[PDB]
DNA sequence: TGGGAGAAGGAGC
DNA sequence: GCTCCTTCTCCCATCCTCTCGAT
RNA sequence: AUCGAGAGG
């Protein structure tokens, strides 16, 4: 659609992150309190971002400048989808799958 | 079940010593002609070699099991139509004790080889509060039996279904007699 | 009470012993007493004291 | 305290009170059951020696 | 000195108290039904 | 048949028979079952099948065809079931708890 | 009176002998015997040098390390009411201390296998 | 107005004078029982 | 009176089960909300919905 | 527990017939039908009050607290 | 008695029929929450706290813990204890809901760290009722 | 993880 | 150009409720 | 909160 929905937006450039209600920080017990995951995954983005910024400063070999955006693209990748198959799943500091938001939209417990 | 064990592991090379003593043949010295009448003698599912004439091997190892030369736990199976011995002996294994009968040729028709004195024996024992459950094993009047060796053997349900007007009400028992 | 039996448990065995009634119909209801928890007219107390000695 | 087994069943003074009328079934007020005999199946009960068969 | 005893005391710590039979960083493994809480309602179960 | 046979010859005043007249609860396999004989056991839809080698149980002679050595119940409930008629019947009857545990999604799906 | 076949009534006596003899539980504790006594001496000698060379293994009895404090017998009870575990401390004759291995109620290494009804009893554990 | 499992002290255990027992060196301790007195309906 | 009907009398063995309606009996008149979707809380421990 | 006062059927006391049920088992021989109907137990309601009983008190007893 | 369910004599019920009593244990600890700071087991004060459950505190003793024999029912305060910040927060923990009883027993013990936590019994007696399971 | 689709890539006339 | 043609990637799998753990 | 277990219709 002209209007709409176009190609060209297909391709992320400029990418919306969410307000602090849709990714809250839960507060269980009494001092056992954590952010959330979409939080730790956009704190990822965010460094992978920053990480190609300083790289593209610094005119990195470009064989270093592609490997870092693999890395953007895998964590922007396993930010909206981490069910991707052939390919491993980003882990927390526990060890477990982020809970990205089509397994948050998917499912009998999804939001839907 | 209540009376149901699983097999704690034994080393089986005490029984391999015991194997090629009694005369099987090596697999290396093991040619597939000349022996076409041969038992595969298979040790904890490794094909360890083949042997002829495998009822006295069975005898003998049935012998020594009802003795404790070979712990009671290990299961020994032969299965004629494809002519294999089977001897189990690693851990896992669930098996439970049951009685043995004998042929008893003096007494006619087939009796169990436990009677009333080893009765009177254990329940002695039991009210002396010396002879225990591993006496009624040392002596072969009691045998554990697991789910593989059960395919070669028939259980009778009663003492009294092997023995050889009529309440009404009683339930029917077969009692084939086999 | 320190018997391997509950305070309450014991306390069910005890309203469970039968007790002499012959004369019931002098004493009054505890409802219908202008008394407290406690009297001569309308109840009567006692008191078990043992030791395992 | 002063009570009637109404509130509580440790106020009731009678263990059993045995109740019985018509021995001989003469009234037909039970039909009884029975297999093959209804009269030497059930037993005959000790009232029935005051009543006429 | 120089042996770390811990590895293995936390480690049989940590399965047996949660049932993942295997170290914490692995989910792979027979899990969360190896040990159970011992159900003592009654004698029987 | 032989059910039938002995609810026929079962009085007027049978409380059973009066259930089963009314149509409250109970009804003639009930009756067959518990006063004549169990019936035959089958499990996946065929009689039971041999699990050891040419038999069902390690009681029976191998190549024993006969109705009894397969998981025919010819007593009653009153009578009482022979150890083998026993096994057979749990047999038969664990079914009747695995389509209510297993199969009852394969139900809820369809309606879904 | 010697050589009588058996009734249907004296088999009791064989299972009362069995369950005399093997109990109820024997399915676990006899498995888990096993592991301490023989199990665990071959998995720390197998592949156990690093070419150092680890060797005997000694399995105590079961213990509590207080806070600032002597290590002393810990029994089931206390274990249960202090929230601690139930472990013993295994030393490795490279006797270096390795670990603490859990240990299984009324198996060889714990006191209740050796203690009567009225050392039970006096212990606060049920018979 | 704290007695251990083994041997029964009753000592006073202010905050100062923590968990513990004189007699033996057991480390559990029950709070004896209320001076107020309680009242149970017999039924 | 008596019945017409003979009742089948006797001892038989009953054994309580750990279900009691003290512990399954529950009602909620708006109490505590999620924080994530603003839905009533799971649990009748947590006078949930 | 320790022994069933009344009797949940009737009402019966059969509190105090337990001592003397285990003297008529024990000291007089007696099986337990004839201990029952010697203690005036008739009602079999009353009659399984004392016959299916387990003393469990006697092993609360055994402990030091 | 219709659909599967009993009637059960009253009488019965109120002679010991199926009574039983009910044994709950709750158990609050104190942690240190870092190197030189430590938790402590208290009666909770009315302005120093920063937080409260709404619960009765006229039961808890000086240490914070009730003696064995107290009628403690629905929300009332069971293990009190304050913790402080990293003035003081409330940490206790009081009864479920809808159970009621008495105090069976206080224990009061030391952890293998050294820190002092309290488990306390509840006992209650859950006579037969209609919609009981049997 | 157990069957199914649907889809895809490949051979053959 | 069908003709398939076998070979692959693919998303599913009843409902509601309760309690107790471990992080 | 997450995870897991067990249990009822
Ligand atoms: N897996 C399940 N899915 C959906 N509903 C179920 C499930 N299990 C049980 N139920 C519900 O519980 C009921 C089963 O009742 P229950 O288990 O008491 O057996 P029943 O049919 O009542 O016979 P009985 O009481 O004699 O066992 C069904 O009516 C059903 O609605
Ligand atoms: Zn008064
Ligand atoms: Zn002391
Ligand atoms: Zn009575």
Same mark, same amino acid.
């Given at each position: 659609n002209?209007?709409?929905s176009?190609?060209?937006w297909?391709?992320? #450039?400029?990418?919306?992150?969410?307000?602090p209600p849709?990714?809250?920080?839960?507060?269980?017990?009494?001092?056992?309190?954590?952010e959330?995951?979409?939080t730790?995954?956009?704190?990822?983005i965010?460094?992978?971002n920053?990480?190609?910024? #300083?790289?593209?400063h610094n005119?990195?070999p470009?064989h270093?400048?592609?490997?870092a955006?693999?890395?953007?693209?895998?964590?922007?990748?396993?930010?909206?989808?981490?069910?991707?198959?052939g390919?491993?799943?980003?882990?927390?500091?526990?060890?477990?799958p982020?809970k990205?938001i089509r397994?948050?939209?998917?499912?009998?417990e999804?939001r839907i | 079940?209540?009376?149901?064990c699983?097999?704690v592991?034994?080393?089986?090379?005490?029984?391999?010593?015991?194997?090629?003593?009694?005369?099987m043949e090596?697999l290396?010295?093991?040619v597939?002609?000349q022996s076409?009448?041969?038992?595969?003698?298979f040790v904890?599912?490794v094909?360890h070699?083949?042997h002829r004439?495998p009822?006295?091997l069975?005898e003998?190892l $049935?012998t020594?099991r009802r003795?404790?030369?070979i712990?009671p736990?290990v299961?020994?199976?032969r299965?004629?139509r494809e002519?294999?011995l /089977?001897i189990?002996?690693?851990?896992?294994?669930?098996?439970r004790?049951?009685?043995?009968?004998?042929?008893?040729?003096?007494?006619?028709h087939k009796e169990?080889?436990?009677?009333?004195?080893?009765?009177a024996?254990?329940?002695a024992? +039991?009210y002396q509060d010396?002879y225990?459950?591993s006496?009624?094993?040392?002596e072969?009047?009691v045998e554990?039996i697991?789910?593989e060796?059960?395919?070669?053997?028939?259980?009778?349900?009663?003492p009294?279904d092997?023995?050889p =007007?009529?309440?009404?009400?009683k339930?029917?028992?077969?009692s084939?007699?086999? | 009470?320190?018997?391997?039996?509950?305070d309450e448990?014991?306390?069910h065995?005890?309203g469970?012993?039968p007790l002499?009634?012959?004369?019931?119909?002098?004493?009054?209801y505890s409802?219908?007493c202008?008394?407290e928890?406690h009297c001569?007219?309308?109840?009567?107390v006692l008191?078990?004291?043992?030791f395992?000695? | @305290?002063?009570?009637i087994?109404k +509130?509580?069943?440790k106020?009731?003074?009678?263990?059993?009170?045995?109740?019985?009328?018509d021995?001989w079934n @003469?009234?037909?007020?039970? =039909?009884?059951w029975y297999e093959?005999d209804?009269?030497?199946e059930?037993?005959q009960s /000790?009232?029935?020696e005051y009543?006429d068969? | 000195?120089?042996?770390?005893?811990?590895?293995?005391?936390?480690?049989?710590?940590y399965?047996?108290? #949660?049932?993942?039979?295997?170290?914490? @960083?692995?989910?792979?493994?027979?899990?969360?039904?190896?040990?159970?809480?011992?159900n $003592?309602?009654?004698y029987?179960? | 048949?032989?059910?039938?046979?002995?609810?026929?010859?079962?009085?007027d005043?049978?409380?059973?028979?009066?259930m089963?007249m009314?149509?409250?609860?109970?009804?003639?396999?009930?009756?067959?079952?518990?006063?004549?004989c169990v019936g035959?056991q089958?499990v996946?839809?065929?009689?039971? %099948?041999?699990?050891?080698? =040419?038999?069902?149980?390690?009681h029976?002679?191998k190549?024993?065809? &006969?109705p009894?050595?397969?998981?025919?119940?010819?007593?009653?409930y009153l009578?009482? !079931?022979?150890?083998?008629?026993?096994?057979?019947?749990?047999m038969?009857?664990?079914?009747?708890?695995?389509?209510?545990?297993?199969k009852?999604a394969?139900?809820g799906?369809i309606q879904? | 009176?010697?050589?009588?076949?058996?009734? %249907?009534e004296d088999?009791?006596?064989?299972?009362?002998a069995?369950?005399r003899?093997?109990?109820?539980?024997?399915q676990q504790?006899?498995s888990?015997?096993?592991?301490?006594d023989?199990?665990?001496?071959?998995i720390?000698?197998?592949d156990?040098?690093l070419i150092?060379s680890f060797?005997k293994i000694?399995?105590?009895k079961?213990?509590?390390?207080? &806070?600032?404090?002597?290590?002393?017998?810990?029994?089931?009870?206390?274990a $249960?009411?202090?929230?601690?575990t139930?472990?013993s401390?295994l030393?490795?004759?490279?006797?270096?201390f390795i670990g603490?291995?859990?240990?299984?109620?009324?198996s060889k290494?714990?006191?209740l296998?050796?203690?009567?009804?009225?050392?039970?009893?006096?212990?606060?554990?049920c018979? | 107005?704290?007695?251990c499992?083994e041997c029964?002290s009753? !000592?006073?255990?202010?905050?100062?004078?923590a968990?513990?027992?004189?007699?033996?060196?057991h480390?559990? !301790?029950?709070?004896?029982?209320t001076?107020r007195?309680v009242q149970?309906?017999a039924? | /009176?008596?019945?017409?009907?003979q009742?089948?009398?006797?001892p038989?063995?009953?054994?309580?089960?750990?279900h009691?309606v003290d512990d399954?009996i529950?009602?909620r008149?708006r109490?505590?909300?999620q924080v994530?979707t603003?839905?009533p809380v799971?649990?009748?421990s947590?006078?949930?919905? | 527990?320790?022994?069933?006062?009344?009797?949940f059927?009737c009402?019966k006391?059969?509190?105090? /017939?337990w001592?003397?049920?285990?003297? !008529?088992?024990?000291e007089?021989?007696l099986?337990?039908?004839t %201990?029952?109907?010697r203690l005036?137990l008739k009602?079999?309601?009353?009659?399984?009050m004392?016959?299916t009983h387990?003393?469990?008190i006697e092993?609360?007893?055994?402990?030091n607290? | 008695?219709?659909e599967?369910?009993?009637?059960?004599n009253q009488?019965s019920? =109120?002679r010991?029929?199926?009574?039983?009593?009910?044994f709950?244990?709750?158990?609050?600890?104190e942690?240190k929450?870092?190197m030189?700071i430590?938790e402590?087991?208290e009666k909770?004060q009315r302005?120093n706290?920063?937080?409260?459950?709404?619960? #009765?505190?006229?039961?808890?003793?000086?240490?914070?813990?009730?003696?064995?024999?107290?009628?403690v029912?629905?929300?009332?305060?069971?293990?009190?204890?304050?913790?402080?910040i990293?003035?003081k927060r409330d940490?206790?923990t009081?009864? $479920?809901?809808?159970?009621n009883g008495?105090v069976?027993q206080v224990l009061?013990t030391?952890?293998q760290?050294?820190?002092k936590?309290?488990?306390?019994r509840?006992?209650?007696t859950?006579?037969?009722?209609?919609?009981?399971?049997?």
């Amino acid at each position: 659609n002209e209007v709409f929905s176009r190609p060209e937006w297909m391709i992320l #450039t400029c990418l919306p992150v969410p307000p602090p209600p849709v990714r809250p920080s839960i507060s269980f017990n009494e001092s056992q309190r954590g952010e959330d995951d979409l939080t730790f995954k956009l704190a990822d983005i965010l460094k992978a971002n920053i990480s190609l910024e #300083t790289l593209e400063h610094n005119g990195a070999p470009h064989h270093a400048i592609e490997e870092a955006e693999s890395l953007l693209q895998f964590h922007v990748a396993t930010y909206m989808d981490n069910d991707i198959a052939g390919q491993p799943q980003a882990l927390q500091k526990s060890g477990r799958p982020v809970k990205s938001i089509r397994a948050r939209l998917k499912g009998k417990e999804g939001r839907i | 079940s209540l009376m149901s064990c699983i097999s704690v592991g034994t080393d089986p090379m005490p029984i391999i010593t015991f194997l090629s003593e009694w005369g099987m043949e090596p697999l290396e010295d093991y040619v597939p002609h000349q022996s076409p009448d041969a038992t595969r003698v298979f040790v904890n599912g490794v094909w360890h070699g083949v042997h002829r004439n495998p009822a006295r091997l069975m005898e003998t190892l $049935r012998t020594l099991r009802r003795k404790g030369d070979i712990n009671p736990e290990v299961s020994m199976i032969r299965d004629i139509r494809e002519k294999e011995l /089977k001897i189990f002996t690693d851990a896992g294994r669930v098996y439970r004790p049951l009685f043995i009968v004998e042929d008893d040729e003096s007494l006619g028709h087939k009796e169990l080889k436990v009677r009333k004195g080893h009765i009177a024996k254990l329940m002695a024992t +039991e009210y002396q509060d010396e002879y225990t459950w591993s006496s009624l094993l040392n002596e072969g009047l009691v045998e554990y039996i697991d789910a593989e060796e059960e395919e070669s053997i028939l259980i009778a349900m009663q003492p009294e279904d092997l023995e050889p =007007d009529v309440d009404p009400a009683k339930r029917i028992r077969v009692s084939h007699h086999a | 009470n320190t018997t391997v039996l509950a305070d309450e448990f014991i306390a069910h065995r005890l309203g469970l012993i039968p007790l002499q009634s012959m004369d019931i119909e002098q004493l009054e209801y505890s409802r219908d007493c202008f008394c407290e928890d406690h009297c001569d007219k309308c109840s009567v107390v006692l008191t078990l004291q043992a030791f395992g000695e | @305290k002063k009570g009637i087994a109404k +509130e509580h069943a440790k106020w009731g003074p009678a263990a059993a009170i045995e109740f019985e009328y018509d021995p001989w079934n @003469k009234l037909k007020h039970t =039909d009884y059951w029975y297999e093959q005999d209804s009269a030497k199946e059930w037993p005959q009960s /000790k009232n029935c020696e005051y009543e006429d068969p | 000195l120089a042996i770390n005893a811990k590895t293995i005391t936390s480690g049989l710590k940590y399965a047996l108290a #949660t049932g993942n039979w295997g170290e914490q @960083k692995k989910a792979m493994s027979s899990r969360a039904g190896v040990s159970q809480v011992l159900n $003592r309602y009654t004698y029987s179960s | 048949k032989a059910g039938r046979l002995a609810e026929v010859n079962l009085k007027d005043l049978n409380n059973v028979k009066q259930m089963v007249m009314a149509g409250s609860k109970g009804s003639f396999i009930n009756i067959a079952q518990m006063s004549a004989c169990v019936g035959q056991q089958s499990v996946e839809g065929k009689r039971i %099948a041999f699990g050891f080698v =040419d038999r069902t149980l390690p009681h029976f002679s191998k190549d024993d065809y &006969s109705p009894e050595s397969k998981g025919f119940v010819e007593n009653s409930y009153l009578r009482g !079931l022979t150890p083998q008629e026993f096994f057979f019947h749990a047999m038969g009857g664990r079914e009747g708890l695995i389509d209510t545990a297993v199969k009852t999604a394969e139900t809820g799906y369809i309606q879904r | 009176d010697e050589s009588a076949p058996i009734t %249907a009534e004296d088999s009791w006596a064989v299972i009362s002998a069995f369950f005399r003899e093997k109990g109820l539980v024997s399915q676990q504790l006899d498995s888990f015997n096993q592991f301490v006594d023989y199990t665990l001496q071959d998995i720390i000698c197998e592949d156990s040098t690093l070419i150092i060379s680890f060797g005997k293994i000694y399995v105590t009895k079961p213990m509590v390390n207080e &806070s600032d404090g002597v290590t002393h017998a810990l029994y089931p009870q206390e274990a $249960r009411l202090r929230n601690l575990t139930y472990s013993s401390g295994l030393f490795v004759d490279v006797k270096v201390f390795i670990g603490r291995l859990p240990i299984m109620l009324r198996s060889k290494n714990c006191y209740l296998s050796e203690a009567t009804e009225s050392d039970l009893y006096k212990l606060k554990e049920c018979p | 107005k704290y007695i251990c499992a083994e041997c029964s002290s009753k !000592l006073s255990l202010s905050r100062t004078d923590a968990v513990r027992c004189k007699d033996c060196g057991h480390r559990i !301790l029950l709070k004896a029982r209320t001076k107020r007195l309680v009242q149970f309906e017999a039924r | /009176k008596k019945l017409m009907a003979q009742i089948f009398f006797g001892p038989t063995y009953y054994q309580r089960l750990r279900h009691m309606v003290d512990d399954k009996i529950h009602a909620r008149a708006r109490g505590p909300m999620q924080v994530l979707t603003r839905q009533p809380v799971e649990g009748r421990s947590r006078d949930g919905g | 527990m320790i022994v069933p006062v009344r009797c949940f059927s009737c009402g019966k006391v059969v509190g105090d /017939k337990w001592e003397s049920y285990l003297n !008529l088992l024990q000291e007089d021989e007696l099986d337990e039908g004839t %201990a029952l109907s010697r203690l005036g137990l008739k009602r079999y309601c009353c009659r399984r009050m004392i016959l299916t009983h387990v003393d469990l008190i006697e092993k609360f007893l055994r402990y030091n607290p | 008695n219709q659909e599967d369910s009993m009637i059960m004599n009253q009488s019965s019920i =109120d002679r010991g029929l199926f009574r039983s009593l009910f044994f709950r244990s709750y158990m609050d600890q104190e942690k240190k929450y870092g190197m030189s700071i430590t938790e402590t087991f208290e009666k909770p004060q009315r302005t120093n706290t920063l937080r409260m459950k709404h619960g #009765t505190y006229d039961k808890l003793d000086d240490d914070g813990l009730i003696a064995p024999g107290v009628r403690v029912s629905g929300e009332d305060v069971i293990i009190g204890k304050t913790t402080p910040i990293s003035s003081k927060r409330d940490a206790s923990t009081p009864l $479920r809901s809808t159970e009621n009883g008495i105090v069976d027993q206080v224990l009061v013990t030391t952890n293998q760290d050294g820190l002092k936590f309290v488990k306390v019994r509840v006992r209650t007696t859950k006579i037969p009722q209609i919609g009981d399971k049997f």
